[PDB]
Amino acid sequence: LNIDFDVFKKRIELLYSKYNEFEGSPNSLLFVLGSSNAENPYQKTTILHNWLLSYEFPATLIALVPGKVIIITSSAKAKHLQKAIDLFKDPESKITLELWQRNNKEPELNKKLFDDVIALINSAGKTVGIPEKDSYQGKFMTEWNPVWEAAVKENEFNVIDISLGLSKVWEVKDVNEQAFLSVSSKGSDKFMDLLSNEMVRAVDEELKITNAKLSDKIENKIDDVKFLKQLSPDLSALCPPNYKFNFDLLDWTYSPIIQSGKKFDLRVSARSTNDQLYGNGCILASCGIRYNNYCSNITRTFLIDPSEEMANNYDFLLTLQKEIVTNILKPGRTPKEVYESVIEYIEKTKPELVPNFTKNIGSLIGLEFRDSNFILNVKNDYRKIQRGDCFNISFGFNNLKDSQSANNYALQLADTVQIPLDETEPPRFLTNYTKAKSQISFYF
């Protein structure tokens, strides 16, 4: 751990200053982190750790009550956090930080800690704010679960969801966050370059390889230390001032996806299939590298011996993205207003494609890959786009008919787009790997 505690103090203060105005008016907040799960990394409590500390702290409880932050954790972790206590000790602080150390040879001490924090919460009032979808396992949780359940039943706690409130508190990216998002996005560009190269070779060398094995080839390159060394200059250059670039901090947002031949699925649920790579028509590729917990996403369509209608529809896909980012994706507008405006545009330029279009044009991106309270569809009329928002702008058309094949085709484009904090400045593409038709088309 090398923790910026000024950033910690800063984000804790922002939270504490917003949370009583969260829906339902919670008197206190409670985050409980079991064991970490690499296969389930975007739970709110984990996102909270990441925003506060840039690390996930397992077997750790954090409570926000009026005038006090309580952290129940190991001795080891309490030493990592110790420098924080002093930082709140000063009279520009409405809040004190307390570290309550667990002792695993002392089970009765440990139970006491839980009883004591629940008493503090009860004092704050009856409404307790917890991320309702959080679901952690392991030994710490098994200690916690019965104690908390008994507390709710005996103390008449009104336990309410705070997911939307948390989503709002950390939505806007500060300069350092924007820079980590830039690094993460450059990593996406690098892996997509490799992906395109590898996909072209697999077609050229007639490789026996499925869509899934090819995307797995790309996925595992994150472990190739030679490959990582190649990436480092371009990525490290983008790191924020005073921050050194670190390999340990580079990860996947999700497993890479390659689609070809028979099956195109434009839903976020899509996975690479076990079908042999199909070296003709449209190839959809998605990469999304994470850096220092900050997610990105890029999606490209490659055209292998396209028909004229395919190539034409690809040109429209480019013109559509340019319209959205330049003219539609504006601060102050809701996801619903943005989406309706997109449909309207397609209606006045290529009306017949409307039924084939995706039901969203992406979501807010950040420490969470896909914020469910900020999807760019018609169901969200309750968020406004803000300066400092980063989006995964991702859309496509599926089930497009190819006059030349029994296989329908599909086209898909995704980029990570930053909205600057400055009013005078336009949306900035963080992913910049080519999407020019002549550079993603291949003839065999």
Curated annotation (Swiss-Prot):
Taxonomy, superkingdom: Eukaryota
Stretches of the chain forming a coiled coil according to its record: 205-231
Main location: nucleus
Signal peptide: none
The keyword Signal is annotated on this UniProt entry: no
Entry's Gene Ontology cellular component terms: chromatin; FACT complex
Sorted UniProt keywords: Activator, Chromosome, Coiled coil, DNA damage, DNA repair, DNA replication, Nucleus, Phosphoprotein, Repressor, Transcription, Transcription regulation
Compartments where found: Nucleus; Chromosome
Any GO BP annotation: nucleosome organization
Task performed by this protein: Component of the FACT complex, a general chromatin factor that acts to reorganize nucleosomes. The FACT complex is involved in multiple processes that require DNA as a template such as mRNA elongation, DNA replication and DNA repair. During transcription elongation the FACT complex acts as a histone chaperone that both destabilizes and restores nucleosomal structure.
Subunit structure: Forms a stable heterodimer with POB3. The SPT16-POB3 dimer weakly associates with multiple molecules of NHP6 (NHP6A or NHP6B) to form the FACT (yFACT or SNP) complex. The FACT complex interacts with the CK2 (casein kinase II) complex subunits CKA1, CKA2, CKB1 and CKB2 and the components of the transcription machinery CHD1, CTR9, PAF1 and CDC73. The FACT complex interacts with the PAF1 complex. Interacts with POL1. Interacts with SAS3. Interacts with YTA7.
Record-stated family: Belongs to the peptidase M24 family. SPT16 subfamily.
The protein, known as: FACT complex subunit SPT16
Taxonomic source organism: Saccharomyces cerevisiae (strain ATCC 204508 / S288c)
Full protein stretch here: 4 to 447 of 1035
